[PDB]
Amino acid sequence: LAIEKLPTGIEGFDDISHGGLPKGRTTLVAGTPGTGKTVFAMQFLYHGIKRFDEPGVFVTFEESPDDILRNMASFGWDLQKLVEEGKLAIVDASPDPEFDLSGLLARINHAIRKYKAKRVVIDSITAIFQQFDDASTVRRELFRLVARLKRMGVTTIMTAERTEEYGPIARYGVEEFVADNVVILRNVLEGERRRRTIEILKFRGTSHQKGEFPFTITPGEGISIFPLSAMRLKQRSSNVRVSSGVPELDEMCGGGFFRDSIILVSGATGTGKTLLVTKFLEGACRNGERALLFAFEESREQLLRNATSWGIDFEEMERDGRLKIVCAYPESTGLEDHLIMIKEVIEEFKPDRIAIDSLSALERVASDRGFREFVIGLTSFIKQQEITGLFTSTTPTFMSHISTITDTIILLRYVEMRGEMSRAINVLKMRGSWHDKEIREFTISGKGMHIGDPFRNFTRILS
Amino acid sequence: EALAIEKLPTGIEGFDDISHGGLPKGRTTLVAGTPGTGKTVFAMQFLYHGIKRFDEPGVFVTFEESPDDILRNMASFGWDLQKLVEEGKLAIVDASPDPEEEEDLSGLLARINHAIRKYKAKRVVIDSITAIFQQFASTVRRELFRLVARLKRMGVTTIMTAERTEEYGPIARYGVEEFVADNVVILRNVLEGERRRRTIEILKFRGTSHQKGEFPFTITPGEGISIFPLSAMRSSNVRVSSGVPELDEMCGGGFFRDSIILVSGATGTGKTLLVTKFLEGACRNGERALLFAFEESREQLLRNATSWGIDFEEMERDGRLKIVCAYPESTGLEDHLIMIKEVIEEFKPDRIAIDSLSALERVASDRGFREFVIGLTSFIKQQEITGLFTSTTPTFMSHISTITDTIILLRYVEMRGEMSRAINVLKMRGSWHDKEIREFTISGKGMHIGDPFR
Amino acid sequence: IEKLPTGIEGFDDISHGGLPKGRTTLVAGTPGTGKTVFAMQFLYHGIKRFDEPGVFVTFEESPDDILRNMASFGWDLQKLVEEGKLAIVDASPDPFDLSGLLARINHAIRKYKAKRVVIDSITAIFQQFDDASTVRRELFRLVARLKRMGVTTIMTAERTEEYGPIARYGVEEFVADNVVILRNVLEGERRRRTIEILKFRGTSHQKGEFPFTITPGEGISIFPLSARSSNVRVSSGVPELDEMCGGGFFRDSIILVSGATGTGKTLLVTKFLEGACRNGERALLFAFEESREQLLRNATSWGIDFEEMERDGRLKIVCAYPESTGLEDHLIMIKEVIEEFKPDRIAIDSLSALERVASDRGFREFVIGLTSFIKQQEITGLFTSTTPHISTITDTIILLRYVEMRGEMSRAINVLKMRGSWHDKEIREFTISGKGMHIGDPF
Amino acid sequence: LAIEKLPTGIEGFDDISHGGLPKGRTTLVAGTPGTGKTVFAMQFLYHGIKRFDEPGVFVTFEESPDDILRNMASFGWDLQKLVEEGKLAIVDASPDPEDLSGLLARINHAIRKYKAKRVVIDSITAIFQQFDDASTVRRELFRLVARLKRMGVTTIMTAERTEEYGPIARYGVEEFVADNVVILRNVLEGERRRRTIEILKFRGTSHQKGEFPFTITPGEGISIFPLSAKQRSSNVRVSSGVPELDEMCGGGFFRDSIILVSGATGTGKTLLVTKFLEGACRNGERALLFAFEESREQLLRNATSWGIDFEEMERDGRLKIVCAYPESTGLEDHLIMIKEVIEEFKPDRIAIDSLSALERVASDRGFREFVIGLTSFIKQQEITGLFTSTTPTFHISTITDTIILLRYVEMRGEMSRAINVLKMRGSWHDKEIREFTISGKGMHIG
Numbered sequence A: 001l002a003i004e005k006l007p008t009g010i011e012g013f014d015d016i017s018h019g020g021l022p023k024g025r026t027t028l029v030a031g032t033p034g035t036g037k038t039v040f041a042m043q044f045l046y047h048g049i050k051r052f053d054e055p056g057v058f059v060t061f062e063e064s065p066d067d068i069l070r071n072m073a074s075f076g077w078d079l080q081k082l083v084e085e086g087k088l089a090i091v092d093a094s095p096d097p098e099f100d101l102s103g104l105l106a107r108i109n110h111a112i113r114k115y116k117a118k119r120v121v122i123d124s125i126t127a128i129f130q131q132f133d134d135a136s137t138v139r140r141e142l143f144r145l146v147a148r149l150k151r152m153g154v155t156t157i158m159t160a161e162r163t164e165e166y167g168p169i170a171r172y173g174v175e176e177f178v179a180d181n182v183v184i185l186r187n188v189l190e191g192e193r194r195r196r197t198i199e200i201l202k203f204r205g206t207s208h209q210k211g212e213f214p215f216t217i218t219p220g221e222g223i224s225i226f227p228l229s230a231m232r233l234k235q236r237s238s239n240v241r242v243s244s245g246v247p248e249l250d251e252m253c254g255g256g257f258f259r260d261s262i263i264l265v266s267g268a269t270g271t272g273k274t275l276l277v278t279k280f281l282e283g284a285c286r287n288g289e290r291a292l293l294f295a296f297e298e299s300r301e302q303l304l305r306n307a308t309s310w311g312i313d314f315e316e317m318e319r320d321g322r323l324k325i326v327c328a329y330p331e332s333t334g335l336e337d338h339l340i341m342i343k344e345v346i347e348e349f350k351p352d353r354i355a356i357d358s359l360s361a362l363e364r365v366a367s368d369r370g371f372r373e374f375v376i377g378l379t380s381f382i383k384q385q386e387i388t389g390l391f392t393s394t395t396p397t398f399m400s401h402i403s404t405i406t407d408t409i410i411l412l413r414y415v416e417m418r419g420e421m422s423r424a425i426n427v428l429k430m431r432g433s434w435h436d437k438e439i440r441e442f443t444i445s446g447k448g449m450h451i452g453d454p455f456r457n458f459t460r461i462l463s
Numbered sequence B: 001e002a003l004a005i006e007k008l009p010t011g012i013e014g015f016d017d018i019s020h021g022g023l024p025k026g027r028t029t030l031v032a033g034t035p036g037t038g039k040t041v042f043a044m045q046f047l048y049h050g051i052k053r054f055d056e057p058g059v060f061v062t063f064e065e066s067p068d069d070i071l072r073n074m075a076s077f078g079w080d081l082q083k084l085v086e087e088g089k090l091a092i093v094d095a096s097p098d099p100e101e102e103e104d105l106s107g108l109l110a111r112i113n114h115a116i117r118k119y120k121a122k123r124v125v126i127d128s129i130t131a132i133f134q135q136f137a138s139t140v141r142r143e144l145f146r147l148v149a150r151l152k153r154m155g156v157t158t159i160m161t162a163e164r165t166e167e168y169g170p171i172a173r174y175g176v177e178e179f180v181a182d183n184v185v186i187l188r189n190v191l192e193g194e195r196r197r198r199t200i201e202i203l204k205f206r207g208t209s210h211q212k213g214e215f216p217f218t219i220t221p222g223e224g225i226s227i228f229p230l231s232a233m234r235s236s237n238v239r240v241s242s243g244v245p246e247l248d249e250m251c252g253g254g255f256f257r258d259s260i261i262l263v264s265g266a267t268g269t270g271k272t273l274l275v276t277k278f279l280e281g282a283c284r285n286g287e288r289a290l291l292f293a294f295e296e297s298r299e300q301l302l303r304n305a306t307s308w309g310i311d312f313e314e315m316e317r318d319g320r321l322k323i324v325c326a327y328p329e330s331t332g333l334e335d336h337l338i339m340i341k342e343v344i345e346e347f348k349p350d351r352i353a354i355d356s357l358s359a360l361e362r363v364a365s366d367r368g369f370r371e372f373v374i375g376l377t378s379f380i381k382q383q384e385i386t387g388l389f390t391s392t393t394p395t396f397m398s399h400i401s402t403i404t405d406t407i408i409l410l411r412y413v414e415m416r417g418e419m420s421r422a423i424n425v426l427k428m429r430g431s432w433h434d435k436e437i438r439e440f441t442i443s444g445k446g447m448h449i450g451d452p453f454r
Numbered sequence C: 001i002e003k004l005p006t007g008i009e010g011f012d013d014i015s016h017g018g019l020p021k022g023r024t025t026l027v028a029g030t031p032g033t034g035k036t037v038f039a040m041q042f043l044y045h046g047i048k049r050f051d052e053p054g055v056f057v058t059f060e061e062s063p064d065d066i067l068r069n070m071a072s073f074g075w076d077l078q079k080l081v082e083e084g085k086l087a088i089v090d091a092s093p094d095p096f097d098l099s100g101l102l103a104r105i106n107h108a109i110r111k112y113k114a115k116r117v118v119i120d121s122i123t124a125i126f127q128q129f130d131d132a133s134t135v136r137r138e139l140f141r142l143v144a145r146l147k148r149m150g151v152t153t154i155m156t157a158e159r160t161e162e163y164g165p166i167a168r169y170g171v172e173e174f175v176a177d178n179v180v181i182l183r184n185v186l187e188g189e190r191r192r193r194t195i196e197i198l199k200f201r202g203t204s205h206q207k208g209e210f211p212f213t214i215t216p217g218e219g220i221s222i223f224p225l226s227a228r229s230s231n232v233r234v235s236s237g238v239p240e241l242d243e244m245c246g247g248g249f250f251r252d253s254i255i256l257v258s259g260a261t262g263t264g265k266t267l268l269v270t271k272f273l274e275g276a277c278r279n280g281e282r283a284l285l286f287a288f289e290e291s292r293e294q295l296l297r298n299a300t301s302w303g304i305d306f307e308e309m310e311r312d313g314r315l316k317i318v319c320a321y322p323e324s325t326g327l328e329d330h331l332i333m334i335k336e337v338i339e340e341f342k343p344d345r346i347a348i349d350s351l352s353a354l355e356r357v358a359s360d361r362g363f364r365e366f367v368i369g370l371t372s373f374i375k376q377q378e379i380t381g382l383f384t385s386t387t388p389h390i391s392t393i394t395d396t397i398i399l400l401r402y403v404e405m406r407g408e409m410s411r412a413i414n415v416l417k418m419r420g421s422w423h424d425k426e427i428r429e430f431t432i433s434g435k436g437m438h439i440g441d442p443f
Numbered sequence D: 001l002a003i004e005k006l007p008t009g010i011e012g013f014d015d016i017s018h019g020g021l022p023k024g025r026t027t028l029v030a031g032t033p034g035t036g037k038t039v040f041a042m043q044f045l046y047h048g049i050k051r052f053d054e055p056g057v058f059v060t061f062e063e064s065p066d067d068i069l070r071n072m073a074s075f076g077w078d079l080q081k082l083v084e085e086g087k088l089a090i091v092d093a094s095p096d097p098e099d100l101s102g103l104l105a106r107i108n109h110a111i112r113k114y115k116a117k118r119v120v121i122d123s124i125t126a127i128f129q130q131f132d133d134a135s136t137v138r139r140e141l142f143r144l145v146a147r148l149k150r151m152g153v154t155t156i157m158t159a160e161r162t163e164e165y166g167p168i169a170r171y172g173v174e175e176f177v178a179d180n181v182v183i184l185r186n187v188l189e190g191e192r193r194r195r196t197i198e199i200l201k202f203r204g205t206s207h208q209k210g211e212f213p214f215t216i217t218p219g220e221g222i223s224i225f226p227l228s229a230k231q232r233s234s235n236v237r238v239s240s241g242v243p244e245l246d247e248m249c250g251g252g253f254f255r256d257s258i259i260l261v262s263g264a265t266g267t268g269k270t271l272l273v274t275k276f277l278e279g280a281c282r283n284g285e286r287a288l289l290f291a292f293e294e295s296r297e298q299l300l301r302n303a304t305s306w307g308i309d310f311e312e313m314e315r316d317g318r319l320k321i322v323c324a325y326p327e328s329t330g331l332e333d334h335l336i337m338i339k340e341v342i343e344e345f346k347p348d349r350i351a352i353d354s355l356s357a358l359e360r361v362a363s364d365r366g367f368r369e370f371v372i373g374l375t376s377f378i379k380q381q382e383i384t385g386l387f388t389s390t391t392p393t394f395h396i397s398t399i400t401d402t403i404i405l406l407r408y409v410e411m412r413g414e415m416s417r418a419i420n421v422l423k424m425r426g427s428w429h430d431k432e433i434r435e436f437t438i439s440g441k442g443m444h445i446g
């Protein structure tokens, strides 16, 4: 058989939930203040109408209907229309400053029938315990509401507050009663930085993905969940070769970089990583293909000034409309946030080539787990969209395991030689091509890079 | 008495090994756990297996989920539900206030005693004893205390489920670990770095022996609860080929058909090439080959294989090759096994290949991985299949090593102005092998393993 | 939701505009965070920046004290009291008034026609009462009528622990719309002031903690460092090095001199600051290792004269200790002195000293924040770093090394990295004397 | 000895307790549910009535006398017969679904009736639950110990705990049943439980301080292992299974010796293990193999290849191969097992392949404890012990008597292997690094 589920509209949740929220049942959304219990509730009712024309009811035991509307309107949600259309109904159960319980419970049951709603929200189920001191009576009344909503065949979602993030499901023993489905939101503080996370603890009779998943409440978008579990090892590959910007490196790769590829350029500082990047993006704009560049080290001025000395004209291509130097700081937001910005501008720009510089900048202010998840998540999409990607990783050991993902590993190192700090290049991997296995000496000028001959008496330096 | 505490088996996979036979018969057992630990599933499976295998009718007393819901919830598992209920095989007694606007032994004792008598049951489940408290204290404890005695006299192997607040803390809510102090089974679902892991444990069995500690399990759909007792886990001179003939000579004839081979090295060394040759060997002779990729897409695998001179679509069309392809983060290792064991059972392969294990190491803890490789190597051995595992050495510039029969090792080597490669068969049980580190060249023909280094 | 610029440096950045206008915000924090000060800044800046009358109420302190406590900041608050820009309703218990005190508060708002308002310690009320009926009176008019009156309110509240509940007496339950958390985290034997906006129901904000500091002549100075490289070369101080660095250092460049002790890193800072003062340019030396005494003779022995640089007002030695405070506290003094000095060049000797007195992030945060300020100010910045990762943050890198040759430790210099220029890629011998550095031939 | 102690008969307690339980006073045996309070308490009575002819009385406030008889059966004591013989008396103080003052009188009479020298009150903590008088209960409990003291009986008074490393016992029974306190623990560490026993205090007498390991074996019960393990050594030599290595050692290994075979992967450590074992079975001796890496199938293939039939040896009862996973149990539970098999097969030689496999599933602390325990046990039992360790090339060193070092080494243009005896306490040893080869006839050193 199959437990039926109702798509939420919060794309990503439907993947994690394997369809949606069990229909005709109550789902408990628990979270500490600031998580996103209210927003999550409207999207459930918003898409409910703006897709399946399923009427919904919002019972607010806290914030005023007027404020609710104002708060939610910034997400581009015209709910005042749905109200006038008779799709949505906001029931004001918030007490006024200037039988109360049992009366409101029935005044709610009126709205569920009047609008004949299938997607109800009881916002702040905890706020009813912080209002009716007869909690014993409240609990008994809430148990009835759940059974009533069940008999009425409504897919309910009742929000609940928590005191601690990694502590109890919810307060006021609200874990029980509404205990068929339990979704937990969190906002954990770690390293003076916050991380919104969503978890589905239990689905009675249904299946779901198990664990926390990063989410974000984006303005003019809403709750955007991005499951790395959804990532499917089903990317496409081709034998079509692009250019690197350096014809010599293209010969060393046996024609050039494959279009459907991820290239790693490893090396110490001052080796010439942010050079092969410029040539990479330059090679695109030259052929008319659109390029990108997410800098996490140098400003546009510096990037352009560095590039102007090498013969690459950025401002031209930037204005011509074949380049988009994003440039930001790794410490500004978080990896989960950065990933969204990258993914956001990609679809907009529709780039032929992407280029991170560096990944090490990002790794610094993260975890070994967080960095992995980021790297694993970002590489996949690029390969899914068939966008050629170059990634820069510094070697703090001047003279992570991202190489497992990358198809091409280009190593740039320094080589001391008779009072002369020379430079060496080698292609370590090409995945699907013949590459030159030779450690060639190269030199940088205002002309670019000149990959020369091997060191012959090459002191075993590389690797 | 002179009655050694008999252990009635429950069928549920692993528990009967962990419980040294099964649940103590003629007694109650506490299946405690926080929300979503799989107590309801555990309880039903106990009953279900009862009525099917041992033909012992069972009664299910619910104090939360309505009978109709329970039937629908346990449906996807593929167990018969209404088929059994509509035959006096199973009985779901409801004690959850069906309505409200109402207000003991009236809604207990006899109701269950009747059910046991009516359906002639030998197994019973009391779902959520903790629910009684929320609904209806010292009186409730008395009734529940008498129920354990009544059920003992009636002679029924009972399971009494309860809830917990914390995973690593008090055994059960409302000190039910006193009313049903005798047999305790703990189910836990621990956070563990944003990655939930289910586990099962028998804290105590009064009068009998049991496997101590936490054992992992999974609540799969078409199956139910499956516990993996890595503890419980407990013959050929036929030499098979590798794909590379000179590597076979390095092994002294080839690989044994009943063996696990490890291939370790950094990226770009040529582990995937050896995999494509390993499988090609099977497809050539007319054997079957299964590949589990966790790193490269089905396309890229084929592309890079075609460049080496190895058509897989030919073999995949022949039905001698199958490629899985799945990111490790898709599910957990506990579920990954279940799937691997499924396609092996179905495809009935000769050679297997997991490329790579190192990709699966990132979606688990050390303990979780070690338990995984033990389970996979065991299954592969039990199914009489040659196996090749691959691992990336964090050596760009163990456990499997101890389990694997052959350890092949790939490495980069600088040759003065050139970056070369080298193969070495570090170990091979029950054969002479070439103990030298040797240069090899990758080409559009394959792997030309050549002269040794010094 | 509209926002009203607070006027607090850095908050309007993190708050993405300001505080939800016409809505109350909760400034929760433990004693000694800066709740009382933050509240005054709001009412203050507003009045001055845009005549928006405000009423401060105090259930704890008394106005005569409050005025004097905020006098150092340089806010003529008496004038506001007379002209009727600011008010101070003393609801502090006299060494009842459930409706009385609040009714008095409502009147003042109507009288002065206040747009801003502050309730200093909404917690105190609970302590300075009897029944928790205060909850009603707080979720009453206090908030509701404030919304009806259309005033942006700040309800200050106390907390017990830094990383615990949002408030003491479940004050959040009432003021549950917008919340701001101030903290004094301690950790180590130093203390860290950080500000976080946990919730702006309806609007967005920069998520997480952000460093802030109460300076005696400014107040809360939140630093949201989360928020034009020229081609004019300057002399390094040593001519051979200038040639090695392709004519000299870019004015918009971060130079990193790296090496052991005895290599000659402080020789190259002395030369660096010297070149500025020579050509009438300001130079500020941040000393973490050495002292005004050690430096003076160290320079004199090399043949530089800070004596006349002190007379000319060209050189400026701060000279402090890394363990005086955390890294957050350090940058302030330099950030301030820079404005007072207008430094063409500036140096930090050393950074390894500061790196020892904090965690990786603390250093990282300092590194990034330090580079920016001067980078966004047009001034050449040299950095000394002892070698027992600003290698990727720095533009130019100089590597000094001891080389053991023939049982006679020699000295060697090399420019490893320089963005935008050709650098000399030879490892040159150098000598030290009473004149300075003598960069010679390579090995 | 100041105060008199009564031997409990439990294996190990009498050692750690320096005699037994202080006689004429009550002892508290506290622990979380499933620690083994009841079993411990019964073995106390059982050995009393049997070995020492001291009658015992069991007072149960939880489990039914009938159940106790059934639960305590597999251990193999005829408790039912001895209840009839007038030695044992299980007082049913268990509550009925539908006054402690009188209940105490019932227990008091039983002691005087049977002339009990030993008494067990099971779960005092229960009493506080069953009867919610609190103060009234505490008083009667204080009167119980007072009365029991006068009649000169040695009492065990059990109590439940919540947390393992938390309070001594619930309901502060500590205050009443002070004087002597024993704590049983069952700690989950790495998804693996650890049974421990500790004498926190003995007022008046000495005892071994700290936790000690124990187990509950189905056919024996509580078996405590005083890790504090008084020996015998001689110039009696024994074979290694390889004649050249015997000559390298100086006429074979010493008998009572711990040998270590360290080396890289594929050197030949398991080979030496297989020969070491054969060296016993081929020279009329018994061998134990604790395999923590290879399965049976793998151990056989290696043996059959090198020309050794372990099956015959096992059929003739000369060899025992355990085969275990390091992750199955904890290392403390692993030793207990090893000791258990030794005290059954009574092996002349013992081999563990390998210690490095055990190190994976244990902390440095735990590994040391294991290595120390195993070494000390083999030497007190006077058995010849070999151990293998995987070393980088592809602390037992200090404790071991012999160190054989296998290594990869190039020579005449060939990557070959070599052996080197590094240590031999009480003998010359060839201090030369000799190359060797492996074949179907085992090792060949040359």
Ligand SMILES: Nc1ncnc2c1ncn2[C@@H]1O[C@H](COP(=O)(O)OP(=O)(O)O)[C@@H](O)[C@H]1O
Binding pocket: A031, A032, A033, A034, A035, A036, A037, A038, A039, A040, A071, A072, A074, A075, A217, A218, A219, A220, C198, C199, C200, C201, C202, C203, C204, C205
């Ligand atoms: N219009 C908006 N634009 C951006 N972020 C918003 C918007 N509205 C709310 N948020 C974010 O959502 C968070 C939680 O909002 P809400 O769901 O109302 O709170 P809670 O989950 O505590 O009930 C806020 O802290 C804020 O960061």
Ligand SMILES: Nc1ncnc2c1ncn2[C@@H]1O[C@H](COP(=O)(O)OP(=O)(O)O)[C@@H](O)[C@H]1O
Binding pocket: A201, A202, A203, A204, A205, A206, A207, A208, B033, B034, B035, B036, B037, B038, B039, B040, B041, B042, B073, B074, B075, B076, B077, B219, B220, B221
């Ligand atoms: N029919 C089903 N199909 C798949 N997974 C199921 C099914 N029923 C339950 N589960 C899984 O089992 C988990 C817990 O099951 P359940 O026994 O209801 O929990 P508990 O006993 O803790 O209340 C659910 O969160 C879900 O992941």
Ligand SMILES: Nc1ncnc2c1ncn2[C@@H]1O[C@H](COP(=O)(O)OP(=O)(O)O)[C@@H](O)[C@H]1O
Binding pocket: A267, A268, A269, A270, A271, A272, A273, A274, A275, A276, A306, A309, A310, A444, A445, A446, C416, C417, C418, C419, C420, C421, C422, C423
């Ligand atoms: N005009 C130039 N002439 C010669 N070399 C230059 C020139 N501009 C830059 N370089 C070289 O480029 C190096 C910096 O390369 P870049 O890719 O920016 O460094 P990174 O390896 O940190 O990414 C400098 O150290 C210098 O050797």
Ligand SMILES: Nc1ncnc2c1ncn2[C@@H]1O[C@H](COP(=O)(O)OP(=O)(O)O)[C@@H](O)[C@H]1O
Binding pocket: A428, A429, A430, A431, A432, A433, A434, A435, B265, B266, B267, B268, B269, B270, B271, B272, B273, B274, B304, B307, B308, B442, B443, B444
């Ligand atoms: N057609 C080809 N001709 C020559 N060399 C190739 C060809 N295809 C791949 N190679 C080389 O062989 C290597 C084998 O890569 P692969 O086996 O996928 O590495 P790994 O198993 O370590 O992930 C490639 O990285 C590349 O250097």
Ligand SMILES: Nc1ncnc2c1ncn2[C@@H]1O[C@H](COP(=O)(O)OP(=O)(O)O)[C@@H](O)[C@H]1O
Binding pocket: C029, C030, C031, C032, C033, C034, C035, C036, C037, C038, C069, C070, C071, C072, C073, C214, C215, C216
């Ligand atoms: N006039 C001042 N000059 C300098 N620092 C001040 C001044 N007033 C307050 N501070 C700083 O702020 C702290 C008190 O801040 P305040 O807002 O009064 O405390 P609270 O947040 O507990 O109400 C002092 O300990 C000091 O660090």
Ligand SMILES: Nc1ncnc2c1ncn2[C@@H]1O[C@H](COP(=O)(O)OP(=O)(O)O)[C@@H](O)[C@H]1O
Binding pocket: B203, B204, B205, B206, B207, B208, B209, B210, D031, D032, D033, D034, D035, D036, D037, D038, D039, D040, D071, D072, D073, D074, D075, D216, D217, D218, D219
């Ligand atoms: N007859 C038996 N056979 C085997 N093991 C037993 C037997 N009786 C008890 N045990 C062991 O003792 C444990 C329970 O010990 P018990 O005496 O009940 O302790 P407590 O009273 O502190 O709960 C069981 O879980 C099991 O490990």
Ligand SMILES: Nc1ncnc2c1ncn2[C@@H]1O[C@H](COP(=O)(O)OP(=O)(O)O)[C@@H](O)[C@H]1O
Binding pocket: B426, B427, B428, B429, B430, B431, B432, B433, D263, D264, D265, D266, D267, D268, D269, D270, D271, D272, D305, D306, D438, D439, D440
């Ligand atoms: N029949 C055989 N003939 C020759 N050499 C063999 C034979 N069987 C095994 N070997 C070699 O001996 C090795 C045995 O190593 P082993 O005893 O398992 O030690 P380790 O534990 O260090 O791997 C094998 O790896 C292989 O190189």
Ligand SMILES: [Mg+2]
Binding pocket: A037, A038, A123, A124, A159
């Ligand atoms: Mg809400």
Ligand SMILES: [Mg+2]
Binding pocket: A270, A273, A274
């Ligand atoms: Mg760079």
Ligand SMILES: [Mg+2]
Binding pocket: B039, B040, B128
């Ligand atoms: Mg349940």
Ligand SMILES: [Mg+2]
Binding pocket: B271, B272, B295, B355, B356
């Ligand atoms: Mg591979």
Ligand SMILES: [Mg+2]
Binding pocket: C035, C036, C060
């Ligand atoms: Mg204050």
Ligand SMILES: [Mg+2]
Binding pocket: C265, C266, C289, C349
């Ligand atoms: Mg110095």
Ligand SMILES: [Mg+2]
Binding pocket: D037, D038, D122
């Ligand atoms: Mg007991």
Ligand SMILES: [Mg+2]
Binding pocket: D269, D270, D293
């Ligand atoms: Mg071995």
